[PDB]
């Protein structure tokens, strides 16, 4: 079927990406990187972000699949010496599709931009003080001073909301954790401190108090919005799929990157 | 229909029980507090606590409701001045029912024993090292050394949870979250730090190292467990029904306790 | 004697400043901004601030004092109406110095720079990547990665350092203090996690490991410092004075800015 | 000169302890536990603490060494194979003492008692809250909700101290520094969250709210006081002393015991 493959563009990954190019020559198997049916990842996490937002416009269309060539990815879980195994059970197919939520951020301004994230997508001020009203389902939470926000997806929070003390929840979960950057809280400013975790359909919204410029990220990309009215975070209509061949728990992998 | 109602024990609360009482008297409401099917809590969230401990057994069968008599609980949620209404909306009918997930405890010794728990349990030391090996649906994940783990519900999130650093979620997400209690690590010693949030399904279970002797609560409830073999967390399948005659919404909750 | 007096700027600010001229016109009392004996702030702990850098450069010669116009500052302990007591009594002098310890920042090319800090001095990189070298007293101590870091004067531990989980030092103690910003651990990356707090004649220094632009902070200062080679910390020798009339303990002033 | 040694108990560390012995047979040294003047302990930082609470009656004429069996000890900084190298340079003298601070713990009734601590002393009630007031130089600061305070030496801020977040300080800063477990805050109830770091003559105190039962801690002992009226916390002016013949930085035991 129809297939392409992206690599981190250094020796080892390159050289991995035209063995198995030649493996699937043996095969009914057709490269294609237009219309692409299996996205195949040889690199790191960095290098599957890329290979994620590359075709984020045909998600229920592709199974992705990571190779990781020097350390060990979350979403990169098969050793570059089982590439070999791995082309031959791609080969016949009947495998089963895994799918992890992602995360729907919305931009409005005085025309509005929606972006996908996978890991996170975070706010911070163009320099000076950030301080934005946080707005549960239209509803007046906080007013939050501080560095900055991070709202995670459920794979993402072993990531950056991992380092912001943020809870490692299971991708099965249907859900954001948004988690404060360097929050001050003192008798007259209160924001609540924990991690907040929201369900589908609950939408937190960011609104300016004073400053309307934010440096604003989505996984790997950074812009600096201006005259910015509105953010809105929600989880995703749209799921990511992976293409699994094995049992590698999640749990397992958490284990294997953090304790040992 | 069926119905009780417990009291905290002070002046406040026992004359403010007498007072719906009589109202109910004048509609088609029996007091029955072997089977109730509405269970009426004046007090704090410990009085609500021991009323839901107190009727566990029959959970699909009841309707809970808290007033606060003086504080604002996360269980109750009416106040002592809304007494009069609430006789009356209660006195019809046709009020909704919410449902909120439970955590159950199991404890097994070298004749097993099960718990229910609407906050949290958690596992001490009965003195001295608290060491157990933390396996996660039969695969080993962790050795912890602190003072001990908290495992909560998502309504229970707001309570001990949160002190330990854990997430607030939703109570609409089937889940569970274990969080940590002082713990050590360094050079020889790994713990992940972060809190975990499990899925319905999904079964953690703590195994004593050397010690076999802990100290475990249930909410409000205490005891020390000699012998144990294993102690085993998952989502129950019971839930809690509350009747809502208003919108309330849980953000709304976290916001009046915490921010203002 | 010669002194001055600062203002935020704003209507309160600048015609109380006027009222305190029009006080110290009436005793042996002669203004000047050049070469001032007695800087008078009115205004935030933003006010105060400028003050200390507008006259960094002759410290031992100065005694500070602040007003505070809306809120209350660490820095700035005097109520807007206890201003025409505090004429009078700066008037006769016979006053007590309290002095504070200072941080100094070096930063060294490849002319090397130095700089004072009173609340604090953070590193981050100019987007992109944090990976610097923290070296302490020659030795090397941790390769850290994150969003950046902060060294703390003591009685800057109320402000940034706060806000990142570092401790709150009495100013009496001649120490400094790191803290970290969204730390990355896992099985590979290591860092301390802890703040670190180190007396006077420690060296700290922090050494680029790919990038060598990095964006730092000297209190409200903020410069993108390029071809950075390396950046020293310590305690400084020049420390800042003030003028006390009355009893007014640290722990007393935590007390007001953060319990109620 | 006098000396004694003291065994973890184990294989390993008795046959140890009778090496040493010979070796010392061989110079002008004299074995006396009652008064020795060169206290060697040999196992873990627990042996250490015991070998320190053994003596804690002469710490002005008792020099400390520890060596380490099997793991690497902040206060036992020799290894197992450099115990002859240790032998012979004790043998000669004219080494050098280097001085670590003590917190003094006085705890008063309705007779008083004092206790000194290498690490640290904790604070917990004996079942059920645990509620104080925290007193610094006799100005009431906070009310304490939570699970109980740890008041760490700087040389024990390594140990318990770090578990529950509180900062590593450089031994060579007379103070102590005080950290919050499970601290409950809400819209009620408000702690400063933040380790707190205090200078010599600064004394805390702990003051009872309803529960006057607190099972406290020094170091290793843990005892149960009935009918508690106030506990004192404050820096000793007792110090303990240790012999050093080799350069051996705080900041590199840190390093060696967290990072590798
Ligand atoms: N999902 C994952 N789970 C576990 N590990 C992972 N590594 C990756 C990856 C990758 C290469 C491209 N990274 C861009 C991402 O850098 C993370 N990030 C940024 N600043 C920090 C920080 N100060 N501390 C921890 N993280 C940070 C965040 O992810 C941001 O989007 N993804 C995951
Ligand atoms: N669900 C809730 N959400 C928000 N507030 C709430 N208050 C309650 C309640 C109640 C009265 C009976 N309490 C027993 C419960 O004491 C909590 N707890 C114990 N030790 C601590 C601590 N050191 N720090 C915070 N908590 C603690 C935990 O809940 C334990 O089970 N429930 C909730
Ligand atoms: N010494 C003090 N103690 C207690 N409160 C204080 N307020 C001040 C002040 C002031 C107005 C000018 N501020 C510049 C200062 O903003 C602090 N800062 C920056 N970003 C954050 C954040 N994300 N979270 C908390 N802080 C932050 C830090 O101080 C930086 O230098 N000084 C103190
Ligand atoms: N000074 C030190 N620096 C770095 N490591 C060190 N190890 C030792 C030692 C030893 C063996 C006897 N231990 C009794 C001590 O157990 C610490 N402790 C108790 N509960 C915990 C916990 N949940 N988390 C971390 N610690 C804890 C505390 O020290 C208490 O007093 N001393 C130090």
Known sequence: ??????????????????????????????????????????????????????????????????????????????????????????????????SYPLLKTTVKYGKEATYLALNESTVKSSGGPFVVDVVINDIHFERFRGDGLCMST????????????????????????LTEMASINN????????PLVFPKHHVVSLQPVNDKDFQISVDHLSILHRDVQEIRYEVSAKKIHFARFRSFPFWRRVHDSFIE
């Not at 129809?2 to 981190?8: L, R, W």
């Not at 990571?66 to 082309?87: N, Q, S």
């Not at 380092?163 to 099965?172: E, N």
């Open 187 to 194: 008798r007259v400013y209160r924001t609540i401190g924990s």
């Open 1 to 98: 079927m129809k297939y392409m493959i992206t690599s981190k563009g250094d020796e080892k990954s390159d050289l991995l990406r035209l063995n198995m190019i030649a493996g699937f020559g043996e095969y009914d198997m057709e490269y294609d990187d237009v219309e692409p049916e299996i996205v195949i990842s040889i690199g790191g996490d960095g290098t599957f972000l890329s290979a994620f937002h590359q075709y984020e416009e045909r998600l229920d269309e592709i199974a992705f699949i990571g190779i990781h060539t020097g350390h060990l990815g979350f979403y990169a879980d098969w050793r570059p010496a089982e590439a070999d195994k791995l082309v031959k059970l791609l080969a016949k197919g009947e495998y089963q599709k895994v």
């Open 154 to 177: 459920p794979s993402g929070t072993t990531a950056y909301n991992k380092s912001l003390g943020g809870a490692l929840m299971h991708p099965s979960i249907e859900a954001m954790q």
